[PDB]
Write a protein that binds this ligand. Sequence first.
Ligand SMILES: *[C@@](C)(CO)[C@](*)(O)[C@H](CC(C)C)NC(=O)[C@H](Cc1ccccc1)NC(=O)[C@H](CC(C)C)NC(=O)[C@H](CCc1ccccc1)NC(=O)CN1CCOCC1
Ligand SMILES: *[C@@](C)(CO)[C@](*)(O)[C@H](CC(C)C)NC(=O)[C@H](Cc1ccccc1)NC(=O)[C@H](CC(C)C)NC(=O)[C@H](CCc1ccccc1)NC(=O)CN1CCOCC1
Ligand SMILES: *[C@@](C)(CO)[C@](*)(O)[C@H](CC(C)C)NC(=O)[C@H](Cc1ccccc1)NC(=O)[C@H](CC(C)C)NC(=O)[C@H](CCc1ccccc1)NC(=O)CN1CCOCC1
Ligand SMILES: [Cl-]
Ligand SMILES: [Mg+2]
Ligand SMILES: [Mg+2]
Lengths: 195, 195, 204, 196, 125, 233, 212, 222, 222
Amino acid sequence: MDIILGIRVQDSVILASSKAVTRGISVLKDSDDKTRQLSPHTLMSFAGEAGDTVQFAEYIQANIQLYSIREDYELSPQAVSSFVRQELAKSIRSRRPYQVNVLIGGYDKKKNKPELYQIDYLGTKVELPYGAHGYSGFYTFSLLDHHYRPDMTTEEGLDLLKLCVQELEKRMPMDFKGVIVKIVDKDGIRQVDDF
Amino acid sequence: MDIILGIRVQDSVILASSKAVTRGISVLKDSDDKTRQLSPHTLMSFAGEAGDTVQFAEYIQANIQLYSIREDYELSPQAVSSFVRQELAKSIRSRRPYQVNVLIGGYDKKKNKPELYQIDYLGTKVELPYGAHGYSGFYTFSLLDHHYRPDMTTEEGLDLLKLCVQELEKRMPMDFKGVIVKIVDKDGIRQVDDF
Amino acid sequence: SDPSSINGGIVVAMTGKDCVAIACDLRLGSQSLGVSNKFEKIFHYGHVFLGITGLATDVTTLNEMFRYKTNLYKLKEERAIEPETFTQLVSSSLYERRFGPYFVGPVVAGINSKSGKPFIAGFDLIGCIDEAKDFIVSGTASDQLFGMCESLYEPNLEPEDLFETISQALLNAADRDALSGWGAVVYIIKKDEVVKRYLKMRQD
Amino acid sequence: TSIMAVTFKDGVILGADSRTTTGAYIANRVTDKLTRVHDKIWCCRSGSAADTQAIADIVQYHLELYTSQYGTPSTETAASVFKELCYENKDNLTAGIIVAGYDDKNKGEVYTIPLGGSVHKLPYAIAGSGSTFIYGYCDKNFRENMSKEETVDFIKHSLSQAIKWDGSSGGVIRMVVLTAAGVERLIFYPDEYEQL
Amino acid sequence: GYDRALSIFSPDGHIFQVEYALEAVKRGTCAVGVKGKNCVVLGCERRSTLKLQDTRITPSKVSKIDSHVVLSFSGLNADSRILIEKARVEAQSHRLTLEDPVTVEYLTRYVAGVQQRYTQSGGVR
Amino acid sequence: TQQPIVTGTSVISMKYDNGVIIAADNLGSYGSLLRFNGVERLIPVGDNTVVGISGDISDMQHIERLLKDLVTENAYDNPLADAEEALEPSYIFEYLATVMYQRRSKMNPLWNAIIVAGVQSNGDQFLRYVNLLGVTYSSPTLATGFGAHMANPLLRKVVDRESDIPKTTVQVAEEAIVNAMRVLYYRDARSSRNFSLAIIDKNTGLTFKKNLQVENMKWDFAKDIKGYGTQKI
Amino acid sequence: TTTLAFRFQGGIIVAVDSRATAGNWVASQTVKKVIEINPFLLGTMAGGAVDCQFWETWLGSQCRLHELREKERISVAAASKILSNLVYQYKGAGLSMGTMICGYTRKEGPTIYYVDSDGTRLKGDIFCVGSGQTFAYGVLDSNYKWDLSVEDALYLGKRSILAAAHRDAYSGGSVNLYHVTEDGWIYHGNHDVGELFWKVKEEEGSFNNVIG
Amino acid sequence: QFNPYGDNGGTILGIAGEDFAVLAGDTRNITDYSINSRYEPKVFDCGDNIVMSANGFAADGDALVKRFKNSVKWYHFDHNDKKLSINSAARNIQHLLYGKRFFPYYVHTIIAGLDEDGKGAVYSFDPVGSYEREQCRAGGAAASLIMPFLDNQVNFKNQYEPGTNGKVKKPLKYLSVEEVIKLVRDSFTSATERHIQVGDGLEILIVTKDGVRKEFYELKRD
Amino acid sequence: TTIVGVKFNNGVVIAADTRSTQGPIVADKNCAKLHRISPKIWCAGAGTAADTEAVTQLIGSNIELHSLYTSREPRVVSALQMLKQHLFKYQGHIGAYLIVAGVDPTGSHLFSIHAHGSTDVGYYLSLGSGSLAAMAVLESHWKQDLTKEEAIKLASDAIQAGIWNDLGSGSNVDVCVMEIGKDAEYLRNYLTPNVREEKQKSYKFPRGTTAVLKESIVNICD
Ligand SMILES: *[C@@](C)(CO)[C@](*)(O)[C@H](CC(C)C)NC(=O)[C@H](Cc1ccccc1)NC(=O)[C@H](CC(C)C)NC(=O)[C@H](CCc1ccccc1)NC(=O)CN1CCOCC1
Ligand SMILES: *[C@@](C)(CO)[C@](*)(O)[C@H](CC(C)C)NC(=O)[C@H](Cc1ccccc1)NC(=O)[C@H](CC(C)C)NC(=O)[C@H](CCc1ccccc1)NC(=O)CN1CCOCC1
Ligand SMILES: *[C@@](C)(CO)[C@](*)(O)[C@H](CC(C)C)NC(=O)[C@H](Cc1ccccc1)NC(=O)[C@H](CC(C)C)NC(=O)[C@H](CCc1ccccc1)NC(=O)CN1CCOCC1
Ligand SMILES: [Cl-]
Ligand SMILES: [Mg+2]
Ligand SMILES: [Mg+2]
């Protein structure tokens, strides 16, 4: 875990998440997918403490899938993000809190709008045009402040995202082994295989 | 500072040293040469505490150059390594010790033999066929135990060295931005520009 | 960060009939990482042998220091230093650094050239002399060596038999210690000949 | 320790128990805590045995050198030398000393020097761990210009109680009598003082 | 807590509460299941004494337990919701721990196990 | 987690040919303050057992109550309470040992060292130790606190092993105990001159001696000792 | 410890050392670090010895209960997740475990899962776990190809443990080899490093750092 | 702060033969620099031809032995007086120890007896329950002294056949009960010489198909 | 260590055990703890072994130079004064605990010195880990007007108490008797009550048991 990025453009939300799983002085894996599909039009990436990350992600996934079956209906990204925030807000005052930071990228089918939410382990939610967790933000936020425009296409967003990854690969101390990029839009969730 | 390697082959000593200079969450430089020529046939690479490394390297360089001028004669790699060890052995019981680990690759012109010495900040000297400092050794020593042969050529040594760098680039957590490779033989010291 | 157990290593010395033996392992490591399998811990100044375990930089430094001192001794005295005298020199030199000591476990071994008597001695890091008829042990597997020597040892062994006893003491002690081993050397010392043997041992 | 010095009509008497301890072990049950720094200037030692010995030895040296040049020193002078050592080295000392001497002009005098290195001239002084238990008793029973026998009984009864309650005090009760007549050593054993 | 043993044996060896629960099923609207060569079809009766119904929002007779399994029923409508809910929770729990959706046999075995538990637990019918 | 407040010092004991002897001084210390002087630290259970306790006195008093209650409970529905089904030393010890170890395991110990001395129904001598950690051991001589360091060496000169027990009489054994109590008074800063001594003999039974005093002490040589090195007066 | 397991053309190779340490004290040279869960499932052990030993034999009991209840051998994924979910409940309590659940099933094929005591669970083709994992990686990675033969794969696994046994002070004793196929696991012997090192040195010409 | 653990010293030793097994232990019990007892046994017959010793902190050692003895008793009650095999005992003991994983029994446990084929068996446990069957194991204060000697003399480690150029190892063979007791006695006299917590007496429990026999030997008392 | 000093009729006797420890390990089974400061002033040392040896030799050296300078036999109080001022200067960091005894023109003397520099006077003294065991014996059997043979017996009995009851002390009893008008007699190994029993087996290996890789003659000559 380390690098998770998110960019909301005109018609989609793009999430980029690093592939490295490092422990001690060994990179144990270089193809790790740090994300879970919560619903057909909602994707959550995650980063933080080992074990907690996946355990939390899958726990949320199960709950949203349970809701979908019960109501035969897909929760809005806003509704999902509020549910996730509350779980983390409960967690922070537990005996052992979930040390997990997340981005929630979703496409609201009722509004026909992409939505990106950034939530940290404390339960601090914000809706953003672009987001990041960990040290990534210290490079990417200023970069995006400059190059981002709200009316960009998915292709323009991917080029903007390449610019972030290049900067991180240049200036970040650790080798994060590239990123897995996924797009969330009106047609659901798909993975970019060549990045 | 992080990765410094050394391989003694039949007719030469090959030193590989990482190019990254990292501080905090920023790679400040990716072309740093972590070595000093002590004499025409003696090269020292170094790694450790910031500031100490260069300050120590240049201090040793000055002393060996002073000796060379005084006697109009080049000290043997063995003699240089003993001088360096003693300086570090003094240093460790000083008010503020030099936190610097070094490899000394030299070609003894009287013996017509390449020589590689590994010395840590405590003043612990060993002559070796192949050496490393820091976490590098944890991967490279076992690799070299398997693939190294004492009668190898310089070209075979460089291929053996590529195998080390590839393994480090695969399994090391940090991005060390490749290595600068230098060869020490009967004709002196030269740098491999394409590695 | 315990200076005496960073590099690892062991030394053992024994007496026999008109002879002495001193042996050491060859490992030098940095905690878990084995670095060198050629690091000998036994040195000699004339006919007096000195083994040194502990922090490797201090092993090297003290060797260079005692070579320095025994060379000046010989120039002024016009004779080689004896084991009993050298033992006192080691003790004085170590205690000189009482409140900033060398982290070592030295072991003197040799035969007095005048009397012909076998002599061994051990020290702690600050110079306390530990003289013994039978054996001296030192290093990270000293407990193991104490157990091996105490059971295996018997007095008045012949040089060839003594070799077997000291070797088995070191080998089996080393194999129960993570930081010791990686090869071994044994010195058999008679009045006017010295044999040096490298032992075959497991390399893990 | 339990120690005290008491001025009286003919001069001064010093008193002390004989217990030296390491934790709860009694390292010495027959200690002599009454020590000579000059012919008729003595001191009672409490606190660190090493520190008080080292101090007393230095003071004895100073007063011996004083005597060689300027003749017999006053009790005040002796107390001043003790003070100087205790005050200037207060960070590295654990010494509670009572200085007592006999001049012919000034008669019996008692000076006490606590941990800080301050000097206090008193009619009588008590000190040491066991002194805490006899502040009440000594204050109620002390009178100025007592006789030798009354002062001996006062010290004996006092230290008897201090010893009885303080675990860090015990053994014999040593006393040293300083008068114009000379120097007299007295000792009192448990069988006598315990049943007072 | 209410502890009464409601489901108990009678002299002839019958548990009347379980058998009277079958009568409630016999009262319920007809439900049918037919499985073909490559499909299963669940048919359900809906009584026509209820006009002015809103079929958009009225609970459907066939319920999805997961995306691949369905459950229809006959008997008390309120009781069925409890079984469906438990089944849906177990379906998600199975995916979470086994990393594989439930088999139809497993899901059935669970639902059947719940029903059985209510036939020899105190304080429940 | 506790800290002891009012404390009792050494309890010493030994076996002899027909039984056991146990002793302990009558002091309840409060740190360096020798606070209480009428404290009985030997507590008889029946006519065949004496439990000697050192350490925290508040916990000692708690243990007294447990032993007192044990005698009551044993008498319930027990026609042979004063005969075959009377409390043995081994029963009393094992009960205490269980409690001590249970309390240490709950991180709330009874801050004591305990020696159970007695004679079994078959005439065998019983002498066993238990402490705040639940550690138990038996020996011909047993002692707590400073007694372990100073009494045991003296008592072991009389009974050095099992075979020395039949050779040791009650006169010799009591003499060694009384001598040991004197040595402890010389050298233990939290000891008193007054003590109690108990003898449990397989023939004469339980003999409990109160208000004993250390005597025949050597102090005369103190008068010759002057200064701390040089000093001659 | 040093343990590894890698996936290849002919199934899975699993190799482990046999040393057990208590600080610098070598406590045992003959510890079994591979647990045989069933004819198709293996578990490797690294870290706290009883933590690994206890919970992996417990895992075997849970796997047995699965096939009794479900009339079907448990998947490697499900077996690994039982263990990872168990240790996750104990997270923060101080369990020390680095394990690999290796096996074959019909639906999955040959599969390896890394599971550790802070709750990390990872599917992968190659893993090395333990104090000497880096030494094993160095040799394994530099010689690994998917198209290795069963004979070469077995040797590489053996040779990688040997490499770590030599350099890592807290690895050694002997090498235990296993080969996992569609037909189940196959044991390929206990190989003492005492003899194996010299045999490999002579035949291969490697280990030139050592005095021959 | 209250420290619930203590060190009672002593050392133990288990060796397995072909049709027998021995479990030895010194009888000295200590705390710090004091001797508590010169004869306090810590090697016990637990029934079903199983002998056991839990050396280290004696309070935990006794507690464990007591619980295992009780476990043997209840095994009979619950399984029709079936004999508890040494392998089953070993697994049971693991669960006893691991039950207190987060507040451990501070002991090195060793058990000895015969396996179900009638062959000598020794099992050894770490404080928290990891166990292993072995031919040989020393436990306790002087374990680091005795164990390498056992490697050399019982398992013939580092011993090669004379004249074979260090190529052929000394072949493994079972030792007689006479030879094993010689090694036990020499191990303990050597341990007594060089370890301060070891001495006073040696008590050996020998296990054969005929039952459990005892032997006692004096050790140096300094 | 256990060390003692006992005064008698016409002089003073000191004694010591001969165990040197290294944690729980006996490093030296027969080390000499009795030190000669001058011919008739001897010293028994407990604590840090290097410190007791170094401090006793330094003061012994200075006492010799002082004796030669003054043309007088050295006095015990001089050794006492020089030792205590040295030890005091180092604030207890030099861990030397000494019993100083001897005869001189002033008479016979017995003192003890502690690491921090405090001195004590007595007719009987004991220092070291076994001092409580020794002092118990001394307090039980000491009396005024001891003879030479009685004082030796009492001193050695006090050391024995340490040998048997203190784990820090063991092996043999060294004694030194300093009588007025006579030469001091140093009685090395005055008692040897801890002789190692015959081993059960000879561990003499068959020649060729150890596997060898290389041989070479070492050059010790010029
Ligand atoms: C009563 C007892 C208290 O007021 C008296 O004052 C006497 C004074 C007489 C003897 C002159 N005081 C003592 O007996 C004195 C009590 C004491 C202890 C520590 C600090 C201050 C006062 N005891 C000592 O000085 C002993 C004498 C030795 C046993 C001969 N010394 C020690 O206990 C030394 C003290 C070292 C020290 C500490 C702090 C400041 C100065 C010096 N400590 C040790 O020997 C270490 N000891 C090892 C065993 O573990 C317990 C500590
Ligand atoms: C390599 C060899 C090194 O890590 C492997 O990782 C092996 C794994 C195999 C055995 C499954 N690991 C060990 O050998 C492991 C290293 C270790 C130690 C402690 C914590 C984590 C890892 N060793 C152990 O677990 C040993 C097992 C052998 C039988 C001795 N056990 C101990 O060290 C025990 C128990 C440690 C412990 C763990 C958790 C809670 C409490 C304790 N400790 C002792 O035996 C203590 N010690 C023995 C010597 O006498 C003094 C007391
Ligand atoms: C009885 C035994 C105890 O009171 C006696 O007092 C004897 C006195 C005789 C021998 C003169 N005391 C000892 O035997 C003494 C006990 C001791 C140990 C440690 C500290 C203080 C007292 N033992 C020693 O002094 C040994 C001497 C042997 C023969 C080597 N020395 C050590 O154990 C040294 C301690 C040196 C030291 C340095 C700085 C401050 C204090 C002490 N310790 C080691 O050598 C341990 N270790 C070995 C591995 O390398 C790192 C050091
Ligand atoms: Cl004093
Ligand atoms: Mg190894
Ligand atoms: Mg002893």
